[PDB]
Amino acid sequence: AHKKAGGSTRNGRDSEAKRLGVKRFGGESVLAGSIIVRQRGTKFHAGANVGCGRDHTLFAKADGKVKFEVKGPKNRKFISIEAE
Amino acid sequence: AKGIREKIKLVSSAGTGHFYTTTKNKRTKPEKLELKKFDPVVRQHVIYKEAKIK
Amino acid sequence: GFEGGQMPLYRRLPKFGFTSRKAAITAEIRLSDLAKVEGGVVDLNTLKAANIIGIQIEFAKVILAGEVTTPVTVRGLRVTKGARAAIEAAGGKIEE
Amino acid sequence: PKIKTVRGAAKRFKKTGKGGFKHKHANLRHILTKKATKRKRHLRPKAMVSKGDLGLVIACLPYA
RNA sequence: CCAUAGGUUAAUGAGGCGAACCGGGGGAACUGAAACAUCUAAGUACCCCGAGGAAAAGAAAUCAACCGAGAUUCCCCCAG
RNA sequence: UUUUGUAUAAUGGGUCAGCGACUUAUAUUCUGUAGCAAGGUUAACCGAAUAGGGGAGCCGAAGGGAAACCGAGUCUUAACU
RNA sequence: AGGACCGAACCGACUAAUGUUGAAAAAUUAGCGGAUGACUUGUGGCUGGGGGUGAAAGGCCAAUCAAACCGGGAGAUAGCUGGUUCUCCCCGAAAGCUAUUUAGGUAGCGCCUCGUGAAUUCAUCUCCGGGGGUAGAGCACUGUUUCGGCAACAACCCGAUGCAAACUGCGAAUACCGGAGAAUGUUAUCACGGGAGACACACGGCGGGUGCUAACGUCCGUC
RNA sequence: GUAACGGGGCUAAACCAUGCACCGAAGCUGCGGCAGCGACGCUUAUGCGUUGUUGGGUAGGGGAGCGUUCUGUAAGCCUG
RNA sequence: GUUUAUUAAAAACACAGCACUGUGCAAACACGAAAGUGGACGUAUACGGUGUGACGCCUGCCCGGUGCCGGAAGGUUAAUU
RNA sequence: AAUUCCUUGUCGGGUAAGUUCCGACCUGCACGAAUGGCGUAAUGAUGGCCAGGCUGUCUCCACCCGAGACUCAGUGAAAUUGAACUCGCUGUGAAGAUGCAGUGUACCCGCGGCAAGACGGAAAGACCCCGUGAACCUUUACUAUAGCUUGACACUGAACAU
RNA sequence: CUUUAAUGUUUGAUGUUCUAACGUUGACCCGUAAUCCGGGUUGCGGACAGUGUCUGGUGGGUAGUUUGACUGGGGCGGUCUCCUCCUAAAGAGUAACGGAGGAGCACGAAGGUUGGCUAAUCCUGGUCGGACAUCAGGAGGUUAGUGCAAUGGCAUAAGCCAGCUUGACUGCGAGCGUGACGGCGCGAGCAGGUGCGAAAGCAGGUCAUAGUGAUCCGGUGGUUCUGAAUGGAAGGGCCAUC
Ligand SMILES: [Mg+2]
Ligand SMILES: [Mg+2]
Ligand SMILES: [Mg+2]
Ligand SMILES: [Mg+2]
Ligand SMILES: [Mg+2]
Ligand SMILES: [Mg+2]
Ligand SMILES: [Mg+2]
Ligand SMILES: [Mg+2]
Ligand SMILES: [Mg+2]
Ligand SMILES: [Mg+2]
Ligand SMILES: [Mg+2]
Ligand SMILES: [Mg+2]
Ligand SMILES: [Mg+2]
Ligand SMILES: [Mg+2]
Ligand SMILES: [Mg+2]
Ligand SMILES: [Mg+2]
Ligand SMILES: [Mg+2]
Ligand SMILES: [Mg+2]
Ligand SMILES: [Mg+2]
Ligand SMILES: [Mg+2]
Ligand SMILES: [Mg+2]
Ligand SMILES: [Mg+2]
Ligand SMILES: [Mg+2]
Ligand SMILES: [Mg+2]
Ligand SMILES: [Mg+2]
Ligand SMILES: [Mg+2]
Ligand SMILES: [Mg+2]
Ligand SMILES: [Mg+2]
Ligand SMILES: [Mg+2]
Ligand SMILES: [Mg+2]
Ligand SMILES: [Mg+2]
Ligand SMILES: [Mg+2]
Ligand SMILES: [Mg+2]
Ligand SMILES: [Mg+2]
Ligand SMILES: [Mg+2]
Ligand SMILES: [Mg+2]
Ligand SMILES: [Mg+2]
Ligand SMILES: [Mg+2]
Ligand SMILES: [Mg+2]
Ligand SMILES: [Mg+2]
Ligand SMILES: [Mg+2]
Ligand SMILES: [Mg+2]
Structure with missing residues (x-):
C-alpha cells in the first residue's frame, strides 16, 4: 500500500476555521464566531479571553451559540440591545 | 481492521422486544460478556444483554 | 446526441x-x-360528462372539492368529512 | 416517442405541488451504518437546484 | 422356392426464369454501452428453400374475476 | 483558418462559371400568437372528405405517504407539538 | 562417371555509370553467377483469403499482401482536422473552481445574453462598531548565534549583538464584515426561467513560492 | 555593412533647475446627420422639435430586414 | 543449390549426415461438419514431427523450476442417484 | 573473438608512421559443447588485411572524337501558382524579412551559365507524443471455444463366479 | 423386531463367457463384362468399439478484448483518498513532481456525572545513594500531562484519582456554518424514558480537528404497507443492520 515517499507535497484540505459572524450583527441564532470547529454552548456571545481579551458583541437575537473554546468560552449575560 | 483478533462488531440485543442497537468490541480483551441498558421501541430501558451474556 | 457526460x-x-x-x-x-x-x-359507476370516474375501476372515495349539490343520494361506496358534511344537504348512503 | 430514462424514475420519481420532484436522501445505509447515530435519520427526501435540471426529463403524464 | 432388388416400356407431371410483399432453415460485424466480456446493433445485413395473389394466422386445453367477453387479422388508445 | 500571439517563412486557394454544408419526421419543454375556459381537445374511423360526425382517450382544476390509506390536508413520531 | 571444369544459347541478377517529369511504374551499357541439373521452357490442370503456396523473406497469390479483388451491412465510428454562403441595429463573455480511465472532451457552479418579478436592494464616499497576527519590529517562548562572567574544554544561568516560512511577550497600513447618512449612476442588486459560449490564455505592476531574486521560464494571488 | 542617438547632424540640437509659449489623438469642443432610452415642449393610436445621454467588440444571446425559386391574390396587370 | 518479383544473394534457407520422439496399419499425422482423400496401392531397413547441418576429435555436471514419460496405493474432485 | 564495456587492452609482426589486420597473453564487462565446442582440404559475384602488375583513382589536369547543351525552321509538354509595381545592410518582429523601421544602393528589357534565399517544389511527419484509435503478433493477461481426453445415460443384451 | 450369520432373492460393483443389436478399409455370391453402394453367405471383433446428450480435464490451435492517469516530451522513478503546519498578501479561499509530518485506529472504559487533586525540573538534607529510585522541606512560574502527527486549546482544567453508572439513549429540531452537487458539520430547545448530584445542573461518546467507500445485487431480523381470480404464500416496500 506504498504511497510513502515524503516529497512533502501534502495538503490538509483545510476547512471551517474562519472568523465568520464578525462584529455584532443584527442577531439571529446564526453560528457566527466559530474557529476550531467543535464548539459547544455559547448563547448571546460577549467575546471573552483573558488578560487583554473580552470582545463585546452587544448585538445578537437571543442565542448566538458558537465559539468553542479558543475564543472566549461561553458568553451571554444580560446584553441584547436594550436588555435581556 | 477486520482481523479476527481485534475489534469486531457487536450486534447486541434486548430482552424481549426485538430491538437491535449496535457497537464495537474486541476479542482478546475480556469478552463473552455484555449488557447495558439503551432505550427500546418505546417505554423503559432495562436488559439489553446483547450477545455474550454474563 | 453527444450528451457528453451522461446525466446518470x-x-x-x-x-x-x-x-x-x-x-x-x-x-x-x-x-x-x-x-x-x-x-x-346519485350512486356512481361511469357514464358521465362533467366529472367522470373513467371506467376501469375498483373503488372511489371522493374528497370534497368544488361546489356541491342541492340534491344527492350520495353513494360511491366512498367517504370523507369533506363529504359527510358538505354533500349532507342530501342523501347520505355509503353501502359496500 | 421520447423514452424516459426508466432508471431515474425508480431513483427520484416525484413531483411535489410544483415539480422539483423530491429525489431522496440517505447515504451509507445498508452498507456501513454501524457508524454515527444523530447524523443518520432518514428524515425524508429533498431535491436540488443546480442539479434539478439534469434530473428533469422523466415523467410527462402523471404516473407514479 | 418363392418374394423382393434390379430392368424395359408407356401415360401423366416436374425441371427454368421471376421486382417487391409472405412463410420458413442458417445467421454477422462495424455500432452503442462515451473502455469492454453480460447486454446492444438485430433476428437487421446477408445466404438458402418454398408458395401465393396475397401469404400467414384462425373458431379457445383464450381471457376475465365471481360481472362477463367471445376465432384470426389490421388501425387508434392503454404507455414510453 | 488557428492561436496568448501571425506581414508571417504556420494552414488553404492558379483564375472564372455552376454545384457545395443546421434539413426532415414524430415526441417533450419553453417563448410569441390565436381559439376556448375550470374546463381544453379529440385519435383511428365514418363521411353528402379540408365539413359534419367520433370525446376511445390525453391534459388540468389536489395534494401527502414507500403503500394501505387519508385528503386541503397529509406524512413523520407513542405524540394530540 | 560427375548436383565435375571452361564457355555461347538458355536461366539468373554481384558491381559501377546512365536514367529518376525515363526508351522503361526496375531498364540500358560494361563487366558478373549457373549452364546434364535440387536445370531450363511450351501447353493444359490442381490448391482461395484467416485461406492457399512458401529451400522461410511475412515472401508470392494479376503493377495490391502483418490477411487479395468486387459488391454489400454503410451515410460503420471519428471526444480529431478542415469548411460553413445576405444586410443593418442592441448587449456581450471565458480561458476559473469541483468531479471525471479526466487532462486539446464533458458536466454543475462561475462569467454572457433574453424574459418576469421584487426592496431606497446595489455600489463610491463620511462617520460608528468589529475580528486579525501580515509588513515592520523584537528575541520572554521554540530554534539558531556570538562575545564577555562561575565546568580533571564545553550545554545550563547574568550582561552586551544578531537571525527565522513552518519563533511572537508587540503590531500597522489594509482588505473584509455589519450599522446609520447625503449625493450620484437610463435598479447597476437579488431571485426564478429560455438560449449560450467558456474552461490552452499571454504581458505589465505589486506580494510570493520555485529556478540562479536566470529565462518572451514555471506555479499561485491581485490589478 | 556605419549598426549600442531612427539617419542627418549636434558643444549645446546634452543635462539640471525655473517659467511662458507652440506642435500634438478618432480624447474633448464647435456644426450637421442617424438610431435606442429618460425627460422637456407640446401635440396626444400617435407623433414630431429641444435636450441629457448611449452607440469598439471574437464566442455567443436578442431584435429587425433585403433578395431568390415555387403557391395563392391572377385569363387580373405588364409585354412582339 | 535457395531467398526479399521492384534498395538486402548473405555468415541467412536448403543440403547430405546425426540424434530425439511418435506410428502395429482402418498407422501416427493432415484436408474434411461427414462421406471420402492424402500418408501409400507404402507397412518399422517404413512413414511423420522436432532440433543439429559434410567430414575429423568430441559432445562434460545439474531432473531443483516448467514440460513430457511411468505409477496410481492414498487425499481432492464433475454429471449422475 | 561476428561475443570485451574499459578499448586504439598489453607484447610481438608488417609500416617512415597501422583506432584495421595477423600471432600471443587471459583480466571471458557478458565463449562453451547438436537454440552444438574446437579444427578442417576443397568451394565462395561472401567480411577483413598485405603484395606484385596495372594504371588519369590521385598530384594536376591537357588535347581530341562523337551524343546533347547554343542558332534557325516545324510540332509542342511539366510540376507550381493569394496577388505583385519580386534590391543590399543593421535593427524589428510569432523569436532566421523583397514587403515593417532606418539607411545604403539601383536607367528600362533580354540571352547564356550557377545554384546561396524565396525556411524553394513533391507527399495533411515515416521519428516523438496524444486518441478511453486500428491492425497483426506474444504469452503462466482475461473471457470463451475447435481439437484431443473423462465419466454418467442412452443405441445396449444373455448367463455365471466373487 | 433389532446385533448378527446361511438360502431365496432385488440391486450396485469388478471380473468370466456367449450371440443377437453394433463394427469389420477379410473372403465369397448376385445386382453387374463396377475399384463405389446395396443385398446375401461366411469369418473375425462384440455389448466392446463408436455415436448423441450431459460432465471434469486440457486447450494462443483460434477468437474477442483489456493492459489508467498526473508528468516541465514521453518513459523509469514517484503519486493518485483523508488529517496538521508553512506557502497563503493579519476575513474565507486559492497552485506547483513546493518545505515538513501523521491516519485507514484505540477505549465495558480512555464515556457520563459527582466529589476531590495539581506539573516538569533543580537545591539542601535521607540506610540500603556514589547521574537519576520511594521520603523531607524549599525554589516550585503553560519550560508538565493530553491514548497517536501538527496546529490550536486546556487550571473552572480536556491533565490526575476514586465512588456510582450506561446519555456511546429513541423520536424531532429554531437557526446556522460549509459545499457545483452527492453530501458534510454545529446546534439551543421539545417529547418519552435514563444515569450521576442534596441541589443549581451535566450527559445525544471520547479536548477538537484523520481512522474512510456512493449505487446496484443481494443476506438477517421486525411489520397483517403490498401480494396479479380469492385466502394464503413467494416476492416487493418500509425500519434496523451485514
Ligand atoms: Mg371517457
Ligand atoms: Mg463502446
Ligand atoms: Mg503555438
Ligand atoms: Mg503563409
Ligand atoms: Mg465560384
Ligand atoms: Mg557443373
Ligand atoms: Mg543516380
Ligand atoms: Mg548484361
Ligand atoms: Mg560456365
Ligand atoms: Mg501455366
Ligand atoms: Mg504483386
Ligand atoms: Mg449499420
Ligand atoms: Mg463515412
Ligand atoms: Mg472512474
Ligand atoms: Mg519580516
Ligand atoms: Mg479542461
Ligand atoms: Mg486549464
Ligand atoms: Mg494563469
Ligand atoms: Mg510565460
Ligand atoms: Mg495651442
Ligand atoms: Mg484631431
Ligand atoms: Mg456594436
Ligand atoms: Mg553457390
Ligand atoms: Mg530486392
Ligand atoms: Mg540485390
Ligand atoms: Mg543451425
Ligand atoms: Mg587476434
Ligand atoms: Mg550437452
Ligand atoms: Mg553451426
Ligand atoms: Mg535543343
Ligand atoms: Mg537580407
Ligand atoms: Mg534579420
Ligand atoms: Mg542545373
Ligand atoms: Mg519544402
Ligand atoms: Mg500530419
Ligand atoms: Mg490473441
Ligand atoms: Mg469491437
Ligand atoms: Mg499520460
Ligand atoms: Mg487567511
Ligand atoms: Mg488577506
Ligand atoms: Mg538524594
Ligand atoms: Mg483526542
Missing part, C-alpha cells in the same frame, strides 16, 4: 426502493359534484 452518474447517486399501488389509481370520484351530470340518480 454524479446525478445518479442514492436510489430508494419503492413498488406500486396495484389500485388502478382509484380516482377520487370528484370535486364534490355528486348528483347533476352524475346521471342525477
Whole structure:
C-alpha cells in the first residue's frame, strides 16, 4: 500500500476555521464566531479571553451559540440591545 | 481492521422486544460478556444483554 | 446526441426502493359534484360528462372539492368529512 | 416517442405541488451504518437546484 | 422356392426464369454501452428453400374475476 | 483558418462559371400568437372528405405517504407539538 | 562417371555509370553467377483469403499482401482536422473552481445574453462598531548565534549583538464584515426561467513560492 | 555593412533647475446627420422639435430586414 | 543449390549426415461438419514431427523450476442417484 | 573473438608512421559443447588485411572524337501558382524579412551559365507524443471455444463366479 | 423386531463367457463384362468399439478484448483518498513532481456525572545513594500531562484519582456554518424514558480537528404497507443492520 515517499507535497484540505459572524450583527441564532470547529454552548456571545481579551458583541437575537473554546468560552449575560 | 483478533462488531440485543442497537468490541480483551441498558421501541430501558451474556 | 457526460452518474447517486399501488389509481370520484351530470340518480359507476370516474375501476372515495349539490343520494361506496358534511344537504348512503 | 430514462424514475420519481420532484436522501445505509447515530435519520427526501435540471426529463403524464 | 432388388416400356407431371410483399432453415460485424466480456446493433445485413395473389394466422386445453367477453387479422388508445 | 500571439517563412486557394454544408419526421419543454375556459381537445374511423360526425382517450382544476390509506390536508413520531 | 571444369544459347541478377517529369511504374551499357541439373521452357490442370503456396523473406497469390479483388451491412465510428454562403441595429463573455480511465472532451457552479418579478436592494464616499497576527519590529517562548562572567574544554544561568516560512511577550497600513447618512449612476442588486459560449490564455505592476531574486521560464494571488 | 542617438547632424540640437509659449489623438469642443432610452415642449393610436445621454467588440444571446425559386391574390396587370 | 518479383544473394534457407520422439496399419499425422482423400496401392531397413547441418576429435555436471514419460496405493474432485 | 564495456587492452609482426589486420597473453564487462565446442582440404559475384602488375583513382589536369547543351525552321509538354509595381545592410518582429523601421544602393528589357534565399517544389511527419484509435503478433493477461481426453445415460443384451 | 450369520432373492460393483443389436478399409455370391453402394453367405471383433446428450480435464490451435492517469516530451522513478503546519498578501479561499509530518485506529472504559487533586525540573538534607529510585522541606512560574502527527486549546482544567453508572439513549429540531452537487458539520430547545448530584445542573461518546467507500445485487431480523381470480404464500416496500 506504498504511497510513502515524503516529497512533502501534502495538503490538509483545510476547512471551517474562519472568523465568520464578525462584529455584532443584527442577531439571529446564526453560528457566527466559530474557529476550531467543535464548539459547544455559547448563547448571546460577549467575546471573552483573558488578560487583554473580552470582545463585546452587544448585538445578537437571543442565542448566538458558537465559539468553542479558543475564543472566549461561553458568553451571554444580560446584553441584547436594550436588555435581556 | 477486520482481523479476527481485534475489534469486531457487536450486534447486541434486548430482552424481549426485538430491538437491535449496535457497537464495537474486541476479542482478546475480556469478552463473552455484555449488557447495558439503551432505550427500546418505546417505554423503559432495562436488559439489553446483547450477545455474550454474563 | 453527444450528451457528453451522461446525466446518470454524479446525478445518479442514492436510489430508494419503492413498488406500486396495484389500485388502478382509484380516482377520487370528484370535486364534490355528486348528483347533476352524475346521471342525477346519485350512486356512481361511469357514464358521465362533467366529472367522470373513467371506467376501469375498483373503488372511489371522493374528497370534497368544488361546489356541491342541492340534491344527492350520495353513494360511491366512498367517504370523507369533506363529504359527510358538505354533500349532507342530501342523501347520505355509503353501502359496500 | 421520447423514452424516459426508466432508471431515474425508480431513483427520484416525484413531483411535489410544483415539480422539483423530491429525489431522496440517505447515504451509507445498508452498507456501513454501524457508524454515527444523530447524523443518520432518514428524515425524508429533498431535491436540488443546480442539479434539478439534469434530473428533469422523466415523467410527462402523471404516473407514479 | 418363392418374394423382393434390379430392368424395359408407356401415360401423366416436374425441371427454368421471376421486382417487391409472405412463410420458413442458417445467421454477422462495424455500432452503442462515451473502455469492454453480460447486454446492444438485430433476428437487421446477408445466404438458402418454398408458395401465393396475397401469404400467414384462425373458431379457445383464450381471457376475465365471481360481472362477463367471445376465432384470426389490421388501425387508434392503454404507455414510453 | 488557428492561436496568448501571425506581414508571417504556420494552414488553404492558379483564375472564372455552376454545384457545395443546421434539413426532415414524430415526441417533450419553453417563448410569441390565436381559439376556448375550470374546463381544453379529440385519435383511428365514418363521411353528402379540408365539413359534419367520433370525446376511445390525453391534459388540468389536489395534494401527502414507500403503500394501505387519508385528503386541503397529509406524512413523520407513542405524540394530540 | 560427375548436383565435375571452361564457355555461347538458355536461366539468373554481384558491381559501377546512365536514367529518376525515363526508351522503361526496375531498364540500358560494361563487366558478373549457373549452364546434364535440387536445370531450363511450351501447353493444359490442381490448391482461395484467416485461406492457399512458401529451400522461410511475412515472401508470392494479376503493377495490391502483418490477411487479395468486387459488391454489400454503410451515410460503420471519428471526444480529431478542415469548411460553413445576405444586410443593418442592441448587449456581450471565458480561458476559473469541483468531479471525471479526466487532462486539446464533458458536466454543475462561475462569467454572457433574453424574459418576469421584487426592496431606497446595489455600489463610491463620511462617520460608528468589529475580528486579525501580515509588513515592520523584537528575541520572554521554540530554534539558531556570538562575545564577555562561575565546568580533571564545553550545554545550563547574568550582561552586551544578531537571525527565522513552518519563533511572537508587540503590531500597522489594509482588505473584509455589519450599522446609520447625503449625493450620484437610463435598479447597476437579488431571485426564478429560455438560449449560450467558456474552461490552452499571454504581458505589465505589486506580494510570493520555485529556478540562479536566470529565462518572451514555471506555479499561485491581485490589478 | 556605419549598426549600442531612427539617419542627418549636434558643444549645446546634452543635462539640471525655473517659467511662458507652440506642435500634438478618432480624447474633448464647435456644426450637421442617424438610431435606442429618460425627460422637456407640446401635440396626444400617435407623433414630431429641444435636450441629457448611449452607440469598439471574437464566442455567443436578442431584435429587425433585403433578395431568390415555387403557391395563392391572377385569363387580373405588364409585354412582339 | 535457395531467398526479399521492384534498395538486402548473405555468415541467412536448403543440403547430405546425426540424434530425439511418435506410428502395429482402418498407422501416427493432415484436408474434411461427414462421406471420402492424402500418408501409400507404402507397412518399422517404413512413414511423420522436432532440433543439429559434410567430414575429423568430441559432445562434460545439474531432473531443483516448467514440460513430457511411468505409477496410481492414498487425499481432492464433475454429471449422475 | 561476428561475443570485451574499459578499448586504439598489453607484447610481438608488417609500416617512415597501422583506432584495421595477423600471432600471443587471459583480466571471458557478458565463449562453451547438436537454440552444438574446437579444427578442417576443397568451394565462395561472401567480411577483413598485405603484395606484385596495372594504371588519369590521385598530384594536376591537357588535347581530341562523337551524343546533347547554343542558332534557325516545324510540332509542342511539366510540376507550381493569394496577388505583385519580386534590391543590399543593421535593427524589428510569432523569436532566421523583397514587403515593417532606418539607411545604403539601383536607367528600362533580354540571352547564356550557377545554384546561396524565396525556411524553394513533391507527399495533411515515416521519428516523438496524444486518441478511453486500428491492425497483426506474444504469452503462466482475461473471457470463451475447435481439437484431443473423462465419466454418467442412452443405441445396449444373455448367463455365471466373487 | 433389532446385533448378527446361511438360502431365496432385488440391486450396485469388478471380473468370466456367449450371440443377437453394433463394427469389420477379410473372403465369397448376385445386382453387374463396377475399384463405389446395396443385398446375401461366411469369418473375425462384440455389448466392446463408436455415436448423441450431459460432465471434469486440457486447450494462443483460434477468437474477442483489456493492459489508467498526473508528468516541465514521453518513459523509469514517484503519486493518485483523508488529517496538521508553512506557502497563503493579519476575513474565507486559492497552485506547483513546493518545505515538513501523521491516519485507514484505540477505549465495558480512555464515556457520563459527582466529589476531590495539581506539573516538569533543580537545591539542601535521607540506610540500603556514589547521574537519576520511594521520603523531607524549599525554589516550585503553560519550560508538565493530553491514548497517536501538527496546529490550536486546556487550571473552572480536556491533565490526575476514586465512588456510582450506561446519555456511546429513541423520536424531532429554531437557526446556522460549509459545499457545483452527492453530501458534510454545529446546534439551543421539545417529547418519552435514563444515569450521576442534596441541589443549581451535566450527559445525544471520547479536548477538537484523520481512522474512510456512493449505487446496484443481494443476506438477517421486525411489520397483517403490498401480494396479479380469492385466502394464503413467494416476492416487493418500509425500519434496523451485514
Ligand atoms: Mg371517457
Ligand atoms: Mg463502446
Ligand atoms: Mg503555438
Ligand atoms: Mg503563409
Ligand atoms: Mg465560384
Ligand atoms: Mg557443373
Ligand atoms: Mg543516380
Ligand atoms: Mg548484361
Ligand atoms: Mg560456365
Ligand atoms: Mg501455366
Ligand atoms: Mg504483386
Ligand atoms: Mg449499420
Ligand atoms: Mg463515412
Ligand atoms: Mg472512474
Ligand atoms: Mg519580516
Ligand atoms: Mg479542461
Ligand atoms: Mg486549464
Ligand atoms: Mg494563469
Ligand atoms: Mg510565460
Ligand atoms: Mg495651442
Ligand atoms: Mg484631431
Ligand atoms: Mg456594436
Ligand atoms: Mg553457390
Ligand atoms: Mg530486392
Ligand atoms: Mg540485390
Ligand atoms: Mg543451425
Ligand atoms: Mg587476434
Ligand atoms: Mg550437452
Ligand atoms: Mg553451426
Ligand atoms: Mg535543343
Ligand atoms: Mg537580407
Ligand atoms: Mg534579420
Ligand atoms: Mg542545373
Ligand atoms: Mg519544402
Ligand atoms: Mg500530419
Ligand atoms: Mg490473441
Ligand atoms: Mg469491437
Ligand atoms: Mg499520460
Ligand atoms: Mg487567511
Ligand atoms: Mg488577506
Ligand atoms: Mg538524594
Ligand atoms: Mg483526542
